[PDB]
Enzyme design. Structure first.
Site, PDB file in Angstrom:
ATOM      1  N   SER A  22       0.668  -0.852   0.281  1.00  0.00           N
ATOM      2  CA  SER A  22      -0.227   0.070  -0.377  1.00  0.00           C
ATOM      3  C   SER A  22       0.561   1.215  -0.245  1.00  0.00           C
ATOM      4  CB  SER A  22      -1.107  -0.033   1.012  1.00  0.00           C
ATOM      5  OG  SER A  22      -1.730  -1.988   0.745  1.00  0.00           O
ATOM      6  N   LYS A  36       0.482   3.344  -3.073  1.00  0.00           N
ATOM      7  CA  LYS A  36      -0.289   4.306  -3.239  1.00  0.00           C
ATOM      8  C   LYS A  36       0.410   6.091  -3.028  1.00  0.00           C
ATOM      9  CE  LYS A  36      -4.445   1.530  -1.149  1.00  0.00           C
ATOM     10  NZ  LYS A  36      -3.733   0.320  -1.349  1.00  0.00           N
ATOM     11  N   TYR A  78     -10.637   3.086   3.649  1.00  0.00           N
ATOM     12  CA  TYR A  78     -10.135   2.596   3.690  1.00  0.00           C
ATOM     13  C   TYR A  78      -9.998   1.600   2.119  1.00  0.00           C
ATOM     14  CZ  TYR A  78      -4.548   1.476   2.980  1.00  0.00           C
ATOM     15  OH  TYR A  78      -3.444   1.358   2.139  1.00  0.00           O
ATOM     16  N   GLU A  82      -0.987   9.511   4.436  1.00  0.00           N
ATOM     17  CA  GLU A  82      -1.737  10.552   6.880  1.00  0.00           C
ATOM     18  C   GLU A  82      -0.840  11.303   6.654  1.00  0.00           C
ATOM     19  OE1 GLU A  82      -2.037   6.256   8.002  1.00  0.00           O
ATOM     20  OE2 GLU A  82      -2.663   5.905   6.163  1.00  0.00           O
ATOM     21  N   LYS A 123       2.750   6.713   6.603  1.00  0.00           N
ATOM     22  CA  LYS A 123       2.054   5.578   5.545  1.00  0.00           C
ATOM     23  C   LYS A 123       2.909   3.619   5.750  1.00  0.00           C
ATOM     24  CE  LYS A 123      -0.776   4.080   2.690  1.00  0.00           C
ATOM     25  NZ  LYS A 123      -1.715   2.744   3.602  1.00  0.00           N
ATOM     26  N   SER A 160       1.321  -3.931   2.796  1.00  0.00           N
ATOM     27  CA  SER A 160       1.742  -4.558   2.584  1.00  0.00           C
ATOM     28  C   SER A 160       1.891  -5.477   2.133  1.00  0.00           C
ATOM     29  CB  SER A 160       1.287  -5.056   4.194  1.00  0.00           C
ATOM     30  OG  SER A 160       1.438  -4.997   5.857  1.00  0.00           O
TER      31      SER A 160
HETATM   32  B1  LIG Z   1      -2.203  -1.736   1.623  1.00  0.00           B
HETATM   33  O1  LIG Z   1      -0.827  -2.520   2.319  1.00  0.00           O
HETATM   34  O2  LIG Z   1      -2.511  -1.106   3.073  1.00  0.00           O
HETATM   35  C1  LIG Z   1      -3.093  -3.488   1.613  1.00  0.00           C
HETATM   36  C2  LIG Z   1      -4.488  -3.540   2.778  1.00  0.00           C
HETATM   37  C3  LIG Z   1      -3.857  -4.379   3.616  1.00  0.00           C
HETATM   38  C4  LIG Z   1      -3.351  -5.851   3.124  1.00  0.00           C
HETATM   39  C5  LIG Z   1      -3.320  -6.097   4.910  1.00  0.00           C
HETATM   40  C6  LIG Z   1      -2.476  -5.359   5.732  1.00  0.00           C
HETATM   41  C7  LIG Z   1      -3.281  -3.945   5.163  1.00  0.00           C
HETATM   42  C8  LIG Z   1      -2.705  -3.330   7.288  1.00  0.00           C
HETATM   43  O3  LIG Z   1      -3.380  -4.147   8.743  1.00  0.00           O
HETATM   44  O4  LIG Z   1      -3.015  -2.136   7.125  1.00  0.00           O
HETATM   45  C9  LIG Z   1      -3.799  -3.710   4.906  1.00  0.00           C
HETATM   46  N1  LIG Z   1      -2.675  -4.482   1.145  1.00  0.00           N
HETATM   47  C10 LIG Z   1      -3.172  -5.675   0.233  1.00  0.00           C
HETATM   48  O5  LIG Z   1      -3.712  -5.057  -1.206  1.00  0.00           O
HETATM   49  C11 LIG Z   1      -2.162  -6.052  -0.813  1.00  0.00           C
HETATM   50  C12 LIG Z   1      -2.158  -7.645   0.235  1.00  0.00           C
HETATM   51  C13 LIG Z   1      -1.622  -7.514   1.503  1.00  0.00           C
HETATM   52  C14 LIG Z   1      -1.909  -8.999   2.529  1.00  0.00           C
HETATM   53  C15 LIG Z   1      -2.901  -9.590   2.242  1.00  0.00           C
HETATM   54  S1  LIG Z   1      -3.406  -8.490  -0.225  1.00  0.00           S
END
Ligand SMILES: *[B]([O])([O])[C]([C]C1=[C][C]=[C]C(C([O])=O)=[C]1)[N]C(=O)[C]C1=[C][C]=[C]S1
Length: 353
Positions: free
Chosen positions: A59, A62, A145, A267, A307, A310
């Site tokens: 993320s 983004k 989100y 953020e 920010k 993951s």
């Molecule tokens: B991104 O990293 O915010 C997004 C959504 C996400 C996934 C896992 C954990 C969080 C967190 O705790 O803030 C947020 N990531 C993805 O869509 C890719 C993935 C990561 C894990 C499974 S899909």
């Protein structure tokens, strides 16, 4: 300096605590970069993490999507009051050609979840999914989100520049930021540098193709590159005026959810921030549920920005504070809890006092 020692005290223990194979932590202070590397990019190959190691930003991608949007708003290619129909000709008069580009970018359509449903995969199932969309909350009032929300912003940004999203980053955005090993698709010549991610069963994995993945979580980069990205965020004045504009655009707070200000991708917080304020931005309450927004009331004098990100195999955290001229990047090839990322960074950045 004490920077090396502080990073060792705060980041290094986390590798054993979460059985993380490899970590790269970068600090930038008063224009000087510090790079700390730990462990292995590939367990099976016994390849060490180094300055050439490519990690998945998740993320954190983004922030690149937002910068790309800021750049298109400043070349006159889009407006944040526009709607996606003006660009995705195909989507007029559906309940989604009523949401603005800013609202997509900032998660307030009022009915968009964290992920697409699994069945959605092809271009044709994505084009189909947004037509059927219907509201639930009053648009603009609720933050949830969302990958589809900012992913749609991304595709619409790309339509405006007449290029597929991957070429907007790799040909326009990354070169303007002086990034040399940052990719939406890692080429053949660099595959030996792409780390394995490791899941919670310590199996080697990399990210799976998914719908509108590039704009939501699909960028890969190195520690030197991310430190350059932080540098540019700490100093947009030195950069080409187009990218400078784009960067300042991502720093403007748009609304509040309690102590968290939502900017474009980033953020934003009032500085100094308490640890708990930073942790709250990543609480279940904030990340996983709807929350009703409010207009910005207190415009903070001095700001900081962060920010987390993951993929299944990788963890990333980025934070910078313009008026201490400092920032930190952490990249791991195994997820660790968001709170752990935020806290270590907190101790380190306060101690560089
Ligand atoms: B991104 O990293 O915010 C997004 C959504 C996400 C996934 C896992 C954990 C969080 C967190 O705790 O803030 C947020 N990531 C993805 O869509 C890719 C993935 C990561 C894990 C499974 S899909």
């Amino acid at each position: 300096q004490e920077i090396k020692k502080l990073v060792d005290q705060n980041f290094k223990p986390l590798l054993e605590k979460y059985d993380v194979p490899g970590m790269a932590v970068g600090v930038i202070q008063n224009n000087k970069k510090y790079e700390m590397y730990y462990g292995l990019q590939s367990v099976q190959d016994k390849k060490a993490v180094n300055s050439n190691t490519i990690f998945e930003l998740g993320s954190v991608s983004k922030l690149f999507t937002a910068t790309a949007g800021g750049y298109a708003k400043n070349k006159g290619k889009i407006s944040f009051d526009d709607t996606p129909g003006k660009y995705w000709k195909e989507l007029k008069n559906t309940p989604i050609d009523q949401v603005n580009l800013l609202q997509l970018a900032t998660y307030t359509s009022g009915n968009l979840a964290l992920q697409f449903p699994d069945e959605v995969q092809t271009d044709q199932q994505v084009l189909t999914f947004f037509k059927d969309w219907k509201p639930k909350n009053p648009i603009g009032e609720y933050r949830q989100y969302s990958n589809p929300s900012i992913g749609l912003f991304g595709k619409v940004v790309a339509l405006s520049m007449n290029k597929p999203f991957d070429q907007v980053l790799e040909k326009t955005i990354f070169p303007a930021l002086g990034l040399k090993h940052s990719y939406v698709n890692v080429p053949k010549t660099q595959m030996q540098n792409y780390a394995f991610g490791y899941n919670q069963e310590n199996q080697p994995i990399r990210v799976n193709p998914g719908p509108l993945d590039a704009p939501a979580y699909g960028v890969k980069s190195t520690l030197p590159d991310m430190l350059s990205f932080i540098h540019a965020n700490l100093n947009p004045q030195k950069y080409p005026t187009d990218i400078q504009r784009a960067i300042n655009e991502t720093h403007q707070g748009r609304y509040q959810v309690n102590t968290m200000y939502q900017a474009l991708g980033w953020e934003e917080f009032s500085y100094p921030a308490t640890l708990q304020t930073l942790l709250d931005s990543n609480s279940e309450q904030i990340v996983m549920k709807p929350n009703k927004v409010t207009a910005i009331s207190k415009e903070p004098s001095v700001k900081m920005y962060h920010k987390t990100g993951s993929t299944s195999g990788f963890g990333t955290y980025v934070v910078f504070i313009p008026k201490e001229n400092i920032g930190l990047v952490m990249l791991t090839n195994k997820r660790i809890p968001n709170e752990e990322r935020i806290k270590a960074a907190y101790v380190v950045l306060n101690a560089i006092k």
